[PDB]
Amino acid sequence: VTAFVIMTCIVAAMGGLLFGYDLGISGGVTSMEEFLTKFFPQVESQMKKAKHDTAYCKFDNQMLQLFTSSLYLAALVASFMASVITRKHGRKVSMFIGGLAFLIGALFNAFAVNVSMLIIGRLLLGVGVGFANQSTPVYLSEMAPAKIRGALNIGFQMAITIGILVANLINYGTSKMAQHGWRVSLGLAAVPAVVMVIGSFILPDTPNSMLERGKNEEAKQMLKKIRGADNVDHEFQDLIDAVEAAKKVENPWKNIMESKYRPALIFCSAIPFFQQITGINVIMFYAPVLFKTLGFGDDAALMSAVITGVVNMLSTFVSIYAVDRYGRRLLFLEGGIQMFICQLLVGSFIGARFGTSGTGTLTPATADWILAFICVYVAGFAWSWGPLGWLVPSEICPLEIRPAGQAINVSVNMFFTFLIGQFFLTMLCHMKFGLFYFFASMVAIMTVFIYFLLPETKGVPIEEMGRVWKQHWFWKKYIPEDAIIGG
Ligand SMILES: CCCCCCCC/C=C/CCCCCCCC(=O)OC[C@H](O)CO
Ligand SMILES: CCCCCCCC/C=C/CCCCCCCC(=O)OC[C@H](O)CO
Ligand SMILES: CCCCCCCC/C=C/CCCCCCCC(=O)OC[C@H](O)CO
Ligand SMILES: CCCCCCCC/C=C\CCCCCCCC(=O)OC[C@H](O)CO
Ligand SMILES: CCCCCCCC/C=C\CCCCCCCC(=O)OC[C@H](O)CO
Ligand SMILES: OC[C@H]1O[C@@H](O)[C@H](O)[C@@H](O)[C@@H]1O
């Protein structure tokens, strides 16, 4: 491990900020009266008569769901495009496109003068997210020394949570603007894109992609540079071995369903789905809706998005320290147990305080204990399914289908991000605390799934990952002998 490989992965992980900024900023902007009046005067015309509501709760009308989904549709579709680009031209090439498309969408939003620029900036933001999220995890996983691959991979997620936090702070400040606050909120999304774009000019590409697309001596020089050694023959042989197999495959989507890829295929699909049916993107807004409904500051709701975002970042550090010293399984099991227990605690706490005879017992101290319970649940997510949701699919895919496997990860995730968060929109807004129990069972299901089916992937060089599957009960019947590289 060199100072060069470290700085390279830090600079590449900054692509998480794009997704993170957008996740953090859109809740505040949508509550801004000046922004609603411009683009959705029908929402404003009933926010005017609500006072105790949250505006994004009325994005339940058919045309409003269209506008919301368009970003996830664009990202879902970009991510497949980026599978092809990333393999054909290299990982740093999809990262460039991700930033540049995100930049273009940011200025379109910040300078929108009607609802068609907003759509167009929203389509573009999602293209940015499909490319950034499809290729940055691949880049990190392949560039990092195997010893610390998980730590340097999670920096992508660390960046996502920094994006979430920073956006929430921005919204808090621009919300106290006489005019154009929403333009600042959307417009500052352009700083991370410029950073990502400029960065992509300076990053090297992975020797894995370099060797796979013909640049041989260039691949070994880059391996010797990031590893800092001259005797890279050993792991360069793993690369030679894998490119030998991978260069027999063109159109990885043709062979994706072959038996030797079944483990990676299953997990590239279930891990994104599970990450969302956790309910993280429903539960993260229970407290601000609740706070606003029951009186309490408009500020108070935004203040609790900051507190959660401070907890959501920072918790990330736990996964970063633990993931390579003790593994992925530990974080998956502990994180799920913790998340399971907070969901039962908060579901029943609400169900008690506001349910015996009648309904309606507003309380400050009761509101803070629900936020503490959610924060511990968000912490358990933040060092399990959060980061592990962008680490594990990237590190279980043989070279020829790695980019395609990351695209399955992004597309399934965006599809379910939108689907779960829109389906649960009504219950979240009408304070149906039964959702915490439902999300409890899913966390139970997914924790059991993980326990039995996911082998430990820590410490293994990326191209040797088939030995791990072969040494797992159950999955071992899928992996042919010729798929085990380096031992
Ligand atoms: C109020 C304005 C504030 C503006 C805020 C600007 C945000 C800066 C971006 C940071 C990307 C962070 C991602 C880097 C994650 C690095 C952690 C890591 O990857 O691990 C290191 C490894 O363990 C070593 O041994
Ligand atoms: C490395 C740094 C890169 C720099 C990244 C750029 C920063 C983006 C900020 C954008 C804010 C846009 C503010 C525009 C607000 C003026 C809008 C206006 O005045 O128009 C009113 C409208 O027409 C009424 O109908
Ligand atoms: C080596 C790695 C170091 C590990 C670093 C880990 C840092 C994670 C911190 C988590 C805080 C979770 C506790 C949740 C805080 C509750 C906040 C709250 O309840 O807010 C109420 C507020 O007062 C209403 O107004
Ligand atoms: C080019 C690389 C891949 C690009 C992938 C593109 C695929 C997604 C396309 C459209 C998403 C849906 C867009 C439809 C948006 C309609 C918005 C709207 O109708 O807003 C109404 C407003 O509320 C007034 O009432
Ligand atoms: C990985 C190491 C294993 C560690 C396992 C930890 C699991 C914790 C489970 C439930 C905590 C629920 C209790 C949350 C404590 C919140 C304290 C708090 O601050 O709430 C007080 C409130 O702010 C005043 O009104
Ligand atoms: O930190 C919170 C975020 O973590 C990411 O890993 C997930 O993909 C996001 O949906 C989530 O909102």
Residue numbers in the entry: 21 to 507
Paper quotes:
Arabidopsis thaliana STP10 is a recently characterized member of the STP family with classic STP traits. Found in growing pollen tubes, it is a proton driven symporter that displays low μM range affinity for glucose and can transport glucose, galactose and mannose. A key two-step process in apoplastic sugar import from the phloem is the breakdown of sucrose by invertases to glucose and fructose, followed by transmembrane uptake into sink cells mediated by Sugar Transport Proteins1,2. STPs display significantly higher sugar affinity compared to most other sugar Major facilitators (up to 1000× fold), and have a broad pH optimum compared to their bacterial counterparts.
The structure was determined to 2.4 Å resolution using X-ray crystallography, and the final model was refined to an Rfree of 26.8% and includes residues 21-507 (of 514 residues total). The overall structure adopts a Major Facilitator fold with 12 transmembrane helices (M1-M12) divided in two domains (N and C domain) with a quasi-twofold symmetry perpendicular to the membrane plane. STP10 is in a substrate bound outward occluded state with the N and C domains as a clamp around the central binding site. The central transmembrane binding site is located between the N and C domain and contains unambiguous density for glucose. The C domain creates a T-shaped CH-π interaction from Phe401(M10) to the main ring of glucose, while a large number of key polar interactions mediate specificity. Asn332(M10) is in contact with the hydroxyl group of glucose carbon 6 (C6) while a hydrogen bond network made through Gln295(M7), Gln296(M7), Asn301(M7), Asn433(M11), Thr437(M11), Trp410(M10) and the main chain carbonyl of Gly406(M10) and water, mediate the contact to the C1-C4 hydroxyl groups of glucose. The μM affinity of STP10 for glucose can be explained by the substrate’s interaction to residues in the N domain (Phe39 (M1b), Ile184 (M5) and in particular Leu43 (M1b)) that creates a hydrophobic interaction surface for the substrate. The Lid domain, a fully conserved feature found in all STP sequences, is a protrusion of the first extracellular loop (M1 to M2) and it is covalently linked to the C domain by a disulfide bridge (Cys77 to Cys449). Here we find the only two buried charged residues in the transmembrane region, Asp42(M1b) and Arg142(M4). The distance between Asp42 and Arg142 is ~5 Å indicating that the aspartate is in a protonated state.
